[PDB]
Amino acid sequence: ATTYNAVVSKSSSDGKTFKTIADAIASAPAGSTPFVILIKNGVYNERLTITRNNLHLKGESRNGAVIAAATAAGTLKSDGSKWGTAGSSTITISAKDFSAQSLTIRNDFDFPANQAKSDSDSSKIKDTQAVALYVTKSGDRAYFKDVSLVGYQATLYVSGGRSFFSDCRISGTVDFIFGDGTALFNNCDLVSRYRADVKSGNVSGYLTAPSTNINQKYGLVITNSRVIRESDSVPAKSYGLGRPWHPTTTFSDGRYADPNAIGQTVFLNTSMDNHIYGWDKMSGKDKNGNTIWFNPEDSRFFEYKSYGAGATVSKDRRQLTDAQAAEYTQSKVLGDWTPTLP
Numbered sequence: 001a002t003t004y005n006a007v008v009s010k011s012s013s014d015g016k017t018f019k020t021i022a023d024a025i026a027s028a029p030a031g032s033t034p035f036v037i038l039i040k041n042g043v044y045n046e047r048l049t050i051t052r053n054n055l056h057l058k059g060e061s062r063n064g065a066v067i068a069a070a071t072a073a074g075t076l077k078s079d080g081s082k083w084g085t086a087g088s089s090t091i092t093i094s095a096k097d098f099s100a101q102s103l104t105i106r107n108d109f110d111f112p113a114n115q116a117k118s119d120s121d122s123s124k125i126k127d128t129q130a131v132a133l134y135v136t137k138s139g140d141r142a143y144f145k146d147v148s149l150v151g152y153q154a155t156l157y158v159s160g161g162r163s164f165f166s167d168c169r170i171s172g173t174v175d176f177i178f179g180d181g182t183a184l185f186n187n188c189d190l191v192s193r194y195r196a197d198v199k200s201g202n203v204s205g206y207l208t209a210p211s212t213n214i215n216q217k218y219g220l221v222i223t224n225s226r227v228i229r230e231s232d233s234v235p236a237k238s239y240g241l242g243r244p245w246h247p248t249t250t251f252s253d254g255r256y257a258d259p260n261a262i263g264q265t266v267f268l269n270t271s272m273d274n275h276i277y278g279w280d281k282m283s284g285k286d287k288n289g290n291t292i293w294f295n296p297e298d299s300r301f302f303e304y305k306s307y308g309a310g311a312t313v314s315k316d317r318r319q320l321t322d323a324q325a326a327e328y329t330q331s332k333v334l335g336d337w338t339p340t341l342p
């Protein structure tokens with residue numbers, strides 16, 4: 001038995017429906033009782049920020065129910081300032097017990113068109129991160145089932161508490177799943193995209209850029225999933241599994257790369273095509289303003305029973321034992337939270 005508190009549709013022939021998702025969300029009474037919104041097929045050009053606990057979105061179909069907006073970090077606001085990476089997100093989750101089911105969320109920033117622009121073109125953006133979905137420090141217990149997340153650089157920003165992604169598609173290029181959250185992915189397709197702007201022999205992207213605090217047990221955990229190339233034009237050995245993001249952070253002694261953001265990405269029972277070469281390093285700025293490199297061997301980067309052509313086993317690709325693998329069950333990663341849909 002499932003009932004909807006509000007319905008969103010493109011048609012006036014439907015009847016008692018909201019025209020925009022933002023209006024339906026805003027109509028929810030203040031509080032924390034479950035509020036469930038059905039979103040009928042259509043492309044909704046909207047940016048959403050969710051601040052109400054226990055809010056749930058259900059699309060008519062993943063293929064047909066789309067929430068989309070185009071915003072890069074370097075896109076300018078009215079006051080002439082940049083949106084920034086966090087500010088670029090199509091959907092921002094800043095509440096507890098959110099779920100989305102059977103819908104697509106896109107950042108439509110046209111990265112390839114941007115890169116094709118002439119270097120002297122003043123409209124050419126340098127800050128090319130364009131987030132589709134952002135779970136903030138305030139977000140905990142966010143559940144995404146049968147969802148597709150679309151972007152290029154920085155598609156999915158997972159911060160804060162626990163998020164669970166199931167039966168999902170996530171596409172991107174550079175650092176397309178990133179942040180310090182506990183994010184568990186199960187039965188997802190992680191799609192590495194073609195880079196027209198990258199020379200043969202150079203890196204096209206990185207699936208993950210975790211910034212997990214060293215004291216946090218779990219970061220990005222990918223299980224029973226598929227790491228796939230968007231097309232046959234995506235070269236062999238063009239994508240890294242992850243690189244360590246140490247975010248620029250304000251400390252008492254200045255603003256610099258966080259030394260304690262020692263990210264975790266663990267792949268378990270996941271297929272990988274041969275676009276995967278292994279792990280990689282990442283640079284930041286230190287407390288003195290010098291370039292500092294953070295290395296994968298110093299980070300929490302592990303695999304367990306990877307398969308497919310990209311699943312090579314070497315000293316540069318650390319493997320979990322059976323006993324270690326048992327620490328990455330849904331129960332252990334998510335703790336007392338069982339993700340449920342209304």
Ligand SMILES: COC(=O)[C@H]1O[C@H](O[C@@H]2[C@H](O)[C@@H](O)[C@@H](O[C@@H]3[C@H](O)[C@@H](O)[C@@H](O[C@@H]4[C@H](O)[C@@H](O)[C@@H](O[C@@H]5[C@H](O)[C@@H](O)[C@@H](O[C@@H]6[C@H](O)[C@@H](O)[C@@H](O)O[C@@H]6C(=O)OC)O[C@@H]5C(=O)O)O[C@@H]4C(=O)O)O[C@@H]3C(=O)O)O[C@@H]2C(=O)OC)[C@H](O)[C@@H](O)[C@H]1O
Pocket residue numbers: 073083084085086087129153154174175178209245246247248249250284
């Ligand atoms: C806690 O106190 C309050 O309550 C506070 O709330 C308000 O403020 C908000 C927010 O709550 C607060 O945390 C904050 O702060 C800073 C920024 O303003 C904010 O945008 C955000 O920054 C992130 C990120 O944390 C930061 O490290 C930086 O990251 C860049 C880059 O954007 C990012 O994509 C990545 O890039 C890598 C790589 O470095 C790069 O070379 C290339 O290769 O791309 C890579 C990539 O794609 O990876 C994904 O890392 C970069 C880096 O490490 O430098 O910028 C990010 C961003 O722009 O979003 O958090 C910042 C911080 O705290 O350090 O302020 C916010 C705000 O003011 O709103 C706009 C209230 O305003 C305030 O009054 C108070 O109440």
